[PDB]
RNA sequence: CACAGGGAUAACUGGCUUGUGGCGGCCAAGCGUUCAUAGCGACGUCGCUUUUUGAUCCUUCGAUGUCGGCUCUUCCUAUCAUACCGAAGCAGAAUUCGGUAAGCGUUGGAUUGUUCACCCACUAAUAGGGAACGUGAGCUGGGUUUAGACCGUCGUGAGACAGGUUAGUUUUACCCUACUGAUGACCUCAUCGCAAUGGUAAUUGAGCUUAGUACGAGAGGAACCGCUCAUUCAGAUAAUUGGUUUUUGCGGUUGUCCGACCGGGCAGUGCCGCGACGCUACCAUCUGCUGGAUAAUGGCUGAACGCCUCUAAGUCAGAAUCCAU
RNA sequence: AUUAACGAGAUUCCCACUGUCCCUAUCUACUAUCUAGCGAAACCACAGCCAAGGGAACGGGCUUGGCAGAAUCAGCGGGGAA
RNA sequence: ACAACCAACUUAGAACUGGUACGGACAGGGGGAAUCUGACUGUCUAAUUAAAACAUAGCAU
RNA sequence: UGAAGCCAGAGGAAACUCUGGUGGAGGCUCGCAGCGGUUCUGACGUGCAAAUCGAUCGUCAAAUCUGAGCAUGGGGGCGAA
């Protein structure tokens, strides 16, 4: 047992919840919910999404 | 073959008639076989469905693929405030079945019991059991003593009249659900003294059931109203070209017999049926006073079983609870009957001794990611509040 | 001897009925796998046979070397886009559906697998696990 | 194309019959390494069924909607598979014949309107039938089965063709019963119970071990117990995932309109992304017990019939069978 | 006999696409539904529970059995050879 | 090959910009390889058949 | 979309051939109204209607559509049949 981090938004992923996506390039992505999964599949940039962990780190918040 | 390609029948003939149950509280149709060697003990209890949640535990099943790995599985939480015992019923065995010989009521019945005997309690005079309490008082309660002697001498099956404490649950109802629980155990004399001593004394779910016990849960399922054939029986939907409706059975019978038969699927009532779901393993019997009901030996967070924001459409849990594996019939807030198993268990799965590892307490009102308000504040830092 | 079924496979979401086309994830020369049937399927009216990761199927090659075109080969599914969960409670899915041409005994016809391989495929078939790279 | 009629008379069901179709017996010439009867059984011969087609014309001509397919229920046994057994030209494995037994199953496709057939593939198995050749106020209309049209043969011609093509309106339930659910008067109201009767539900396979062991000269090659799963079916549930969006919840955006761009109206929900609750999917999760009486069969004691032998009196075990929980 | 272009003509295949289908689920509007008002028609020997028998050879009535308890509402499409 | 005063549309080029979205609603061809048949446009069985049927130009008597 | 006719340039010994414009022909083409009526064998089918309604569809500069006046009258008329 362990917790993971959403690769798009940095949210904590407790066991059972969320989804795991294996890109054909052998990459591994973890999503806490469908909101982050949809944005990832729409090839949005996590750094331009204002509620993500990466955005708050770039903008010093 | 005259049925060109044949398939198994849609639905079960063993659950007819599929009509609204004649009751709202699940009924124990049969009690266990009552071995006379075991000590006296109750065999049933009543609780209220609070909701579902998920857990993680280390499986233990030699030969299985996940023999020592962690498995995620759903559980159901049943709120069980302690029950009060207010009566004693004796049954005699007759060539026509079992017959209730006499009933003994303890004095000082609470208003929760007394409301069960009225439809308009608000404007009544509340005269229930007002002249009965004189039996306990007059002649040093000789009338009650005679009835107790009758039960010991004649009756072969003894049951207590149970009582819920719905005032301790977050439900708007004030009527308590009354029940008969059979005292399986020793001799008839032992059963009467066991039941008599339990008068007006609360009985906790701790004594009736253990942690690793396999139980049966009895409740009335979720109502769906008048529903069609495809929903009730799961028949194949008709092609989209059909003129007068698609969700129907095409042939409802042959020419002969010249009748519509009882084995043909027809639209009507679905749900709200009485069901007895069996072989449910208990995972935890939590305490209502403990502040760490959801805390395990691995997750040492002092968190209670109530998810963040409370159980959806139920509320919080401030009483004892039973954590049972899997799903059970009924809806939230529904009174549910827990009964001891009538079978003998020899499977390793049934005999397995469970030990929890983590209990989810994230909100069920959404995609909750935090298990406690403290964890939410450290992750999110400070807000404008 | 015996029939080509994964004898020990746990239940999983299938998401690949017959008539589906998988990418060929090995160097056998094929580029498609047309699923014509699944091994171990029972019998129920109108229900199409379906398989998931690690299930052996019979397939035909719609695109590839002419030596593999007009024949029926036993294949094994190693990827699928339909999400499925293991006993650990996590829901996993890949980018596309893929499979590898094998023989009746289970040995792979090719020698190298392109892309990730689902865990169930590796456990059930020793030769797929040997020739696979990243497995998750 | 029309009228008066006909069930005095055909085409579809039903009724009698069973040649024909199908199925089952008796005898024993032969086949089977020798050996009629393990398995077959010619020449003969006795039957049964009404799932084939005939024969007939009893009912219907002031009409019983006339093929098939889809859907759904139930019944039969002449048992394909599964349970338990007997026999073999049964060493093992595989297979063949037979007994109880219809409890439970008997598939996905290419071609054809097809029944049928023939292949591919899976499967424990892909058994055979009935219910007005079950089922058109259940569907469809592919065929058949009006009127249009084409071709070939036939006819001088109009026209004919179980010869071939293409296009061709499928009506009504609100009545009674039947079924599915839902109320309900009389015996004061209410709570807690009993249980007559009715229904009843489970199914099958694969891995590990047994074990490369028993068996067998090699090749080959089991099963009982015990676990672990999965197929079909059944009941339930909404923690997770997936679906659904009038939460018209928030955000984005197009064209107009409100006079200064905030906030809104309209485009029958303008469109797009996310979307909680609720509902919901072997697209998700959980669960599905055990007595007793037997059938075939193998036995015990034991006469009839001083010997014997499962039966005659008595009696034991025993099937997915019957009854009950 | 062959034909470019054309065809709400008939036929076969391939790509894309999709609830046709595996296997169904959910949402909206208007009905159905309940109420106030208004208010028909087809049809109708008499009526309306079965099993078997016989009978003009497929009965609601006959015979022998099974049985059988007021009054009703919403659906339904087996029967009334409707 | 100039200077001054007017004019309303069309086209082209470049920075910047945005959750890479932009014919953002509306409006708005699915395509290909063939076979049979009629050349094509046109016409008819109002109220079950729009067709390969009729017609047509051309040819012939 | 772009036929005749017309303008300019280029190539060639010549015959003549190319390129860019202009022009606006066709029982041409996409498509709105009108006209029609292919499919859903959709709705309705004691209907709104003794033939209508919805989507989809055919044609859309002409062998297109159409009003009024007039002619043809029953073994007769009229008929792209
Ligand atoms: Mg049939
Ligand atoms: Mg229709
Ligand atoms: Mg005849
Ligand atoms: Mg015969
Ligand atoms: Mg006749
Ligand atoms: Mg006659
Ligand atoms: Mg007639
Ligand atoms: Mg008649
Ligand atoms: Mg009829
Ligand atoms: Mg038999
Ligand atoms: Mg017949
Ligand atoms: Mg009918
Ligand atoms: Mg015709
Ligand atoms: Mg001739
Ligand atoms: Mg004829
Ligand atoms: Mg019973
Ligand atoms: Mg369900
Ligand atoms: Mg969701
Ligand atoms: Mg949801
Ligand atoms: Mg003896
Ligand atoms: Mg009768
Ligand atoms: Mg009658
Ligand atoms: Mg009489
Ligand atoms: Mg009578
Ligand atoms: Mg009827
Ligand atoms: Mg109806
Ligand atoms: Mg017409
Ligand atoms: Mg027409
Ligand atoms: Mg012509
Ligand atoms: Mg138009
Ligand atoms: Mg129309
Ligand atoms: Mg229609
Ligand atoms: Mg109607
Ligand atoms: Mg004019």
Swiss-Prot record, chain A:
Signal peptide range: none
Places the protein is found: Cytoplasm
Family: Belongs to the eukaryotic ribosomal protein eL24 family.
Quaternary state and interactors: Component of the large ribosomal subunit (LSU). Mature N.crassa ribosomes consist of a small (40S) and a large (60S) subunit. The 40S small subunit contains 1 molecule of ribosomal RNA (18S rRNA) and at least 32 different proteins. The large 60S subunit contains 3 rRNA molecules (26S, 5.8S and 5S rRNA) and at least 42 different proteins.
Functional summary from the UniProt entry: Component of the ribosome, a large ribonucleoprotein complex responsible for the synthesis of proteins in the cell. The small ribosomal subunit (SSU) binds messenger RNAs (mRNAs) and translates the encoded message by selecting cognate aminoacyl-transfer RNA (tRNA) molecules. The large subunit (LSU) contains the ribosomal catalytic site termed the peptidyl transferase center (PTC), which catalyzes the formation of peptide bonds, thereby polymerizing the amino acids delivered by tRNAs into a polypeptide chain.
Protein name: Large ribosomal subunit protein eL24
Gene symbol of the encoding locus: rpl-24
Entire-sequence positions represented here: 1 to 61 of 156
Curated annotation (Swiss-Prot), chain B:
Top-level taxon of the source organism: Eukaryota
Gene Ontology molecular-function annotations: RNA binding; structural constituent of ribosome
Places the protein is found: Cytoplasm
Principal location: cytoplasm
GO annotation (BP), single: translation
PROSITE patterns per record: RIBOSOMAL_L3
Alphabetical keyword list: Cytoplasm, Ribonucleoprotein, Ribosomal protein
Gene3D superfamilies cross-referenced by the UniProt entry: 3.30.1430.10, Ribosomal protein L3, domain 3, Translation factors
Entry GO terms, CC: cytosolic large ribosomal subunit
Chain's role: Component of the ribosome, a large ribonucleoprotein complex responsible for the synthesis of proteins in the cell. The small ribosomal subunit (SSU) binds messenger RNAs (mRNAs) and translates the encoded message by selecting cognate aminoacyl-transfer RNA (tRNA) molecules. The large subunit (LSU) contains the ribosomal catalytic site termed the peptidyl transferase center (PTC), which catalyzes the formation of peptide bonds, thereby polymerizing the amino acids delivered by tRNAs into a polypeptide chain.
Family per record: Belongs to the universal ribosomal protein uL3 family.
Subunit (UniProt): Component of the large ribosomal subunit (LSU). Mature N.crassa ribosomes consist of a small (40S) and a large (60S) subunit. The 40S small subunit contains 1 molecule of ribosomal RNA (18S rRNA) and at least 32 different proteins. The large 60S subunit contains 3 rRNA molecules (26S, 5.8S and 5S rRNA) and at least 42 different proteins.
Name used for this protein in its record: Large ribosomal subunit protein uL3
Organism for this UniProt entry: Neurospora crassa (strain ATCC 24698 / 74-OR23-1A / CBS 708.71 / DSM 1257 / FGSC 987)
